[PDB]
Design a protein around this ligand. Structure first.
Ligand SMILES: Nc1ncnc2c1ncn2[C@@H]1O[C@H](COP(=O)(O)OP(=O)(O)OP(=O)(O)O)C[C@H]1O
Ligand SMILES: [Mg+2]
Ligand SMILES: [Zn+2]
Lengths: 166, 76, 48, 34, 86, 50, 122, 89, 97, 99
RNA sequence: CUCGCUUCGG
């Protein structure tokens, strides 16, 4: 989790003019930046606050109100070493599929670093024994449009010990 | 505060046009229309009542600006 | 999950930069190379 | 077929110099302009 | 009259002449080895200025262990004009 | 115009802004005097002067 | 739509929890049919992230508690990431600090661990 | 004043108009379209859209007339709103 | 089209445009000469300055910088003719703000 | 007849008419008399708001034949035009949404 | 349809 500074041109239609400007600006910005992954930034969650809000122009076209807004928004972006606690929402032979709790089913830990009793035999067998911990390793993002996902991340499961659960 | 206190005819035309366009697009009305189905007549009534929520931003050629409220300006 | 891509921006043309195109740039811009001097096919449909 | 009501009553009716293929049941303008 | 062509000519038309085989000998191979050595050694030379990495995620106790250390040559400012001292 | 068969054109603006600009700037009541010397152009004519 | 800084300031899960609770109560106080029908993914992300944070021990936190914890840890010369992870995870067992928490070597001192556990439990 | 603002009496012909105005598109539209366009392409002259004729051609509102100023909406607002304090920093 | 026999519309000649300019009615001039006659929406690549299609620039082989832009259709025809004449008009777009 | 003078500086437009004129002294100097036939052809797009809904309903009910009326309806959500000569005009008038 | 040419109207 980290705060991100953004500047956006928000267009408010005239039928919301009776509303206070800041509230409707926040509502529209949240509607525009919810459950979406900003490239090289991470998955934005919601708006934290609106720091700078300058004058509201009205253009000779649409007739709505366009405002340039400086705001801070919270996003989920680990720092390549953060420790997380997710739940196993699936498992593939080449690697388990852990999902952060109802947050994002994008964490795919490779099984190439645990103690040498590692394999997934397609029966959802996690690990041959000697709340699931995670150490984020690398961030990666990709584009979508290429003709007339985007955050997965790699996960480390070292010899953490895990006295409570193997 | 240095420009003309009188509201120019071009300013009136553009303010009325923008206000009528907003009213035609379901913007709130501030003068309690009496059977006026024409947005432009409603905009003219708002201008006469000096209730138009629009601020003109007069731009000087160098780049400097100054803001005048519609109620602050003088109409003819 | 979903990538944030901006739908539409109120872009306004600022200025037009006139210039010229090199022969390489013409090939890059073009889609096909025209080599046939005739227009329509031989058949009676006369498709291009 | 009409894209709205699914009918096949597509009539070519020009209205004041505007060629127009329109559904004859619900009036949906399928195609216009030549 | 010239014939009409249905498909554009191939992107790389073939040639019946091929490049002459390269010169061989102890000297030429020494040149190749020396050039590869220059490539390998002049990237580590301090004259090869690397792009400054930026935007460190966090500070860590391991930074001191992973701190990149490299000797830096000191320019002779007597010959160089005054404007280029840091 | 002289009503001797002269044809006149008539345009209908399709925008509220354009309609308001036309009514304000180009209203007949707003252009009673020519800009050349300020003389009134819209005035009484034959069979009204008489 | 450009971002000025993607790493402006790291924040703990308590700030996110407080912000999500405030947003949830404001939204339930100002529920709009058209706005909600336009985008429901806001409700999904807020509700599910709030549930996930609630499953974590992030409850029972206050700004005074966070300030006291930060001041207590400021004498241990630990990095910002370490104290952030300790605050988010709330380690009750020593082994969480000993092994899972990075920079373990030469930092635990085998005596500062007890003080760290006392502070995190306080 | 327009004829004598550059220090020399310039006529309203194409030569004087070329010496007075700077926008490529208006010069091309008035007279000698091909020559003006080819010379502009050769010089790489970037032409802005300040003038009226280029505004008309580009389909944008012209700067003169009602387009000189900009309008602002007197919306109920509060610039520089209070910021939520940061606890961890 | 031109004539009544072909159901054509009336023509705003150069002097009509001059009179509209003299009035200063910018919005009505824009509506008459752009919105009501030959309004069109093209896709311009903000990187190369050339015209793309369907939100895609073939010249740059990319779609990140392609932006929609309103324009008279006659202006698009002029731009394409100039491109065919090797007089390449490159448009440097910007936000309306 | 080039692009600049024939299609860029001055170009043909729709929503326009051209008619012979005749005098009429009983009209104010700011008014012009338009034939009924031309008015049935030249249309104005009026946006449905809270003020003219009861007026546009009657205009839609009249249809494209009676002079006070409309020729097309463009829906707010879908941009599919509806020709008023076909379909139940009363239902369309009853289903006039804002915008 | 495109283009030209004429004859009109004003
Ligand atoms: N070539 C043209 N260019 C512009 N306007 C024209 C042209 N031919 C006719 N008109 C229109 O017709 C009008 C000319 O009429 P005018 O010359 O004043 O009277 P007239 O035709 O001499 O009639 P009398 O012979 O005096 O009875 C004015 C103008 O708007
Ligand atoms: Mg006459
Ligand atoms: Zn491009």
């Amino acid at each position: 989790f980290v705060l991100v500074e953004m500047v956006d041109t928000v267009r408010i239609p005239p039928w919301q003019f009776e509303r206070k400007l800041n509230d409707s600006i926040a509502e529209e910005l949240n509607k525009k930046l919810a459950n979406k992954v900003v490239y090289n930034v991470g998955l934005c969650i919601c708006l934290f606050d609106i720091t700078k809000l300058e004058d509201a122009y009205v253009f000779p076209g649409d007739g709505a109100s366009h405002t340039k807004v400086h705001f801070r928004c919270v996003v989920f972006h680990p720092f390549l070493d953060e420790i997380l606690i997710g739940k196993i929402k699936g498992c593939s032979p080449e690697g388990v599929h852990v999902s952060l709790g109802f947050f994002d089913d994008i964490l795919i830990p490779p099984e190439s670093l645990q103690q040498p009793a590692k394999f997934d035999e397609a029966e959802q067998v996690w690990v041959w024994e000697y709340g699931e911990e995670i150490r984020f390793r690398v961030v990666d993002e990709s584009f979508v449009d290429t003709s007339p996902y985007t955050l997965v991340g790699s996960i480390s499961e070292p010899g953490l010990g895990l006295l409570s659960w193997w | 505060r240095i420009t003309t206190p009188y509201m120019t005819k071009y300013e009136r035309a553009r303010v009325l046009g923008t206000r009528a366009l907003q009213i035609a697009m379901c913007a709130p009305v501030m003068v309690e229309l009496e059977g006026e189905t024409d947005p432009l007549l409603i905009a003219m009534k708002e201008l006469k009542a000096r209730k138009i929520p629009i601020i003109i931003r007069r731009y000087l050629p160098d780049g400097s600006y100054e803001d005048w409220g519609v109620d602050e300006l003088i109409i003819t | 999950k979903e990538q944030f891509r901006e739908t539409d921006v109120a872009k306004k043309i600022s200025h037009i930069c006139f210039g010229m195109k090199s022969p390489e740039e013409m090939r890059q811009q073009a889609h096909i190379q025209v080599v046939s001097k005739n227009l329509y096919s031989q058949d009676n449909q006369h498709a291009p | 077929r009409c894209p709205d009501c699914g009918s096949t009553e597509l009539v070519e009716d020009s209205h004041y110099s505007q060629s127009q293929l329109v559904c004859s049941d619900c009036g949906c303008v399928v195609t216009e302009g030549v | 009259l010239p014939d009409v062509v249905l498909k554009p000519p191939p992107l790389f038309p073939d040639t019946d002449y091929k490049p002459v085989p390269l010169k061989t000998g102890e000297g030429e191979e020494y040149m190749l080895a020396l050039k590869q050595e220059l490539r390998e050694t002049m990237k580590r030379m301090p004259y090869f200025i690397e792009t400054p990495e930026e935007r460190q995620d966090i500070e860590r106790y391991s930074k001191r262990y992973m701190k990149v250390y490299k000797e830096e040559w000191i320019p002779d400012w007597r010959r160089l004009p005054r404007e280029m001292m840091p | 115009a002289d009503f001797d068969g002269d044809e006149m054109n008539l345009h209908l603006p399709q925008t509220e802004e354009a309609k308001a600009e036309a009514l304000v700037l180009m209203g007949t009541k707003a252009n009673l005097v020519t800009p050349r010397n300020g003389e009134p152009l819209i005035a009484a004519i034959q069979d009204f002067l008489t | 739509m450009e971002v000025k800084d993607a790493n402006s300031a790291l924040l703990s899960n308590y700030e996110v929890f407080q912000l999500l609770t405030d947003l949830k109560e404001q939204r339930k106080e100002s529920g709009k049919n058209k706005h909600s029908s336009g985008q429901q993914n806001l409700n999904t992300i807020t509700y599910e992230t709030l549930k996930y944070i609630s499953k974590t021990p992030c409850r029972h936190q206050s700004p005074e508690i966070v300030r006291e914890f930060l001041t207590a840890l400021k004498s241990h010369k630990l990095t910002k990431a370490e104290k952030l992870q300790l605050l988010n995870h709330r380690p009750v067992t020593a082994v969480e600090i000993q092994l899972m928490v990075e920079e373990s070597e030469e930092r635990l001192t085998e005596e500062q661990i007890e003080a760290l556990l006392h502070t995190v439990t306080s | 004043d327009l004829m004598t603002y550059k220090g020399e009496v310039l006529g309203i012909t194409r030569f004087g108009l070329a010496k007075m105005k700077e926008s490529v598109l208006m010069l091309a539209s008035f007279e000698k379209t091909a020559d003006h366009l080819f010379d502009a392409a050769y010089f790489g002259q970037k032409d802005s859209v300040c003038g009226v004729s280029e505004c008309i051609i580009m389909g944008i509102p012209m700067n003169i007339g009602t387009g000189l100023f900009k309008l602002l909406h007197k919306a109920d607002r509060d610039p520089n709103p209070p910021k939520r304090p940061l606890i961890f920093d | 089209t031109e004539g009544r026999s072909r159901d054509g519309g009336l023509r705003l000649g150069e002097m009509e445009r001059d009179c509209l300019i003299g009035y200063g009615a910018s919005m009505l001039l824009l509506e008459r000469l752009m919105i009501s006659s030959d309004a069109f929406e093209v896709d311009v690549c903000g990187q190369c300055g050339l015209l793309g299609y369907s939100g895609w620039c073939h010249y740059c082989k990319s779609s990140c910088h392609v932006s929609s832009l309103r324009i008279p259709y006659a202006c698009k025809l002029l731009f394409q003719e100039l491109q065919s004449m090797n007089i390449i008009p490159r448009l440097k777009l910007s936000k309306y703000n | 007849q080039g692009r600049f003078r024939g299609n860029l500086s001055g170009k043909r437009v729709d929503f326009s008419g051209r008619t012979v004129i005749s005098p009429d002294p009983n009209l104010r100097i700011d008014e012009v008399a338009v034939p009924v036939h031309v008015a049935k052809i030249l249309t104005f797009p009026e946006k449905v708001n809270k003020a003219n809904i009861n007026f546009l309903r009657k205009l839609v009910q009249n249809g494209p034949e009676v002079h006070p009326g409309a020729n097309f309806i463009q829906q707010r959500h879908t941009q599919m035009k509806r020709f008023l000569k076909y379909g139940n005009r009363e239902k369309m008038a009853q289903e006039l949404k804002y915008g």
